[PDB]
Every structure is written in structure tokens, then in C-alpha cells.
Scaffold this active site. Structure first.
Site, PDB file in Angstrom:
ATOM      1  CD  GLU A  35      -3.004  -0.736   0.047  1.00 13.47           C
ATOM      2  OE1 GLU A  35      -2.847   0.203  -0.775  1.00 13.47           O
ATOM      3  OE2 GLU A  35      -3.920  -1.592  -0.057  1.00 13.47           O
ATOM      4  CG  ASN A  46      -8.587   6.396  -4.712  1.00  8.53           C
ATOM      5  OD1 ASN A  46      -7.677   5.605  -4.877  1.00  8.53           O
ATOM      6  ND2 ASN A  46      -9.005   6.759  -3.493  1.00  8.53           N
ATOM      7  CG  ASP A  48     -13.741   7.879  -6.180  1.00  9.83           C
ATOM      8  OD1 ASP A  48     -12.587   8.215  -5.798  1.00  9.83           O
ATOM      9  OD2 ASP A  48     -14.569   7.285  -5.408  1.00  9.83           O
ATOM     10  CB  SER A  50     -11.859   9.177  -2.826  1.00  7.29           C
ATOM     11  OG  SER A  50     -11.629   8.046  -3.635  1.00  7.29           O
ATOM     12  CG  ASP A  52      -6.494   5.255  -1.465  1.00  8.92           C
ATOM     13  OD1 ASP A  52      -7.709   5.295  -1.170  1.00  8.92           O
ATOM     14  OD2 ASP A  52      -6.065   4.611  -2.446  1.00  8.92           O
ATOM     15  CG  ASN A  59     -10.967   5.649  -0.604  1.00  9.88           C
ATOM     16  OD1 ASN A  59     -11.433   6.794  -0.704  1.00  9.88           O
ATOM     17  ND2 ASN A  59     -10.847   4.826  -1.653  1.00  9.88           N
TER      18      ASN A  59
END
Ligand code: NA
Length: 129
Positions: A35, A46, A48, A50, A52, A59
């Protein structure tokens, strides 16, 4: 903060992750490796919009507020900036909430695709624990 492998294993174990919801510590160290490469300040945007955040790439769509993820939720009740601290406490505690929500560690795409069904113990080999 960028952790060593054993260093983060030791920090995660201190903060109550080892076998949390039946997920051995190796699982958590493997997830973090893929990660964030063990970096508390890792961020990724991301598709969309958003983002992380942190060692476990939590998220903003669901779990924290960053002010630029419209119509999202804040289920860990924290600013997303909390997940970037050298102190792993906020990330560990929000992760406990995420993994306890129904889907377990499948919430983390890197976990599903790179750790699940693997020899995750390797991730804690050689560590004073
Ligand atoms: Na949010």
C-alpha cells in the site's frame, strides 16, 4: 516517517494489530508494504477523486474527511491528515474499524492481490517481536 519492515511490525504489534480479527501480523505488514512501502505520508488520488492516506492507504470516500471528496463519509471521524503522522495510532485504529466492517482485509486491494493466500509470516521473519 518511513519504517523498516521489522520496525513497523513492532509498531503494529504494540498497537494491537497482531491477530486482530484473526489477521496475523504478517498480513498487516504485507498490506502496508504494498500500500505505502511503509511510508506514513504516502497519498494516492483515486479516479473518483477520493484519496488514500497513510501506511494502509485509507480512503477519504468512506473513512476520513479531507475537504475535497464531495458526498463522502467520515466513519473514523478524523481528518485524513491524521493518517499521515509518524505516530501510527490513528491509522491502526481506523484500520481496526475498516477490517471489522464485513469484508475483512479484502477492503485493501493490495492485500487481496498480493498478500492473501501467501506465506505472510515471511513478512515478520527476523524481527524481534
Ligand atoms: Na470523506
Amino acid at each position: 516517517k518511513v519504517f523498516g519492515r521489522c520496525e513497523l511490525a513492532a509498531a503494529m504489534k504494540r498497537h494491537g494489530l497482531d491477530n486482530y480479527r484473526g489477521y496475523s501480523l504478517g498480513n498487516w505488514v504485507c498490506a502496508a508494504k504494498f500500500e505505502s512501502n511503509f511510508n506514513t505520508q504516502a497519498t494516492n488520488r483515486n479516479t473518483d477523486g477520493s484519496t488514500d492516506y497513510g501506511i494502509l492507504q485509507i480512503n477519504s470516500r468512506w473513512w476520513c474527511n479531507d475537504g475535497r471528496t464531495p458526498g463522502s463519509r467520515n466513519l473514523c471521524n478524523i481528518p485524513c491528515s491524521a493518517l499521515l503522522s509518524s505516530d501510527i495510532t490513528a491509522s491502526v485504529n481506523c484500520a481496526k474499524k475498516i477490517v471489522s466492517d464485513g469484508n475483512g482485509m479484502n477492503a485493501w486491494v493490495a492485500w487481496r492481490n498480493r498478500c492473501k493466500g501467501t506465506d505472510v509470516q515471511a513478512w515478520i521473519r527476523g524481527c524481534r517481536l
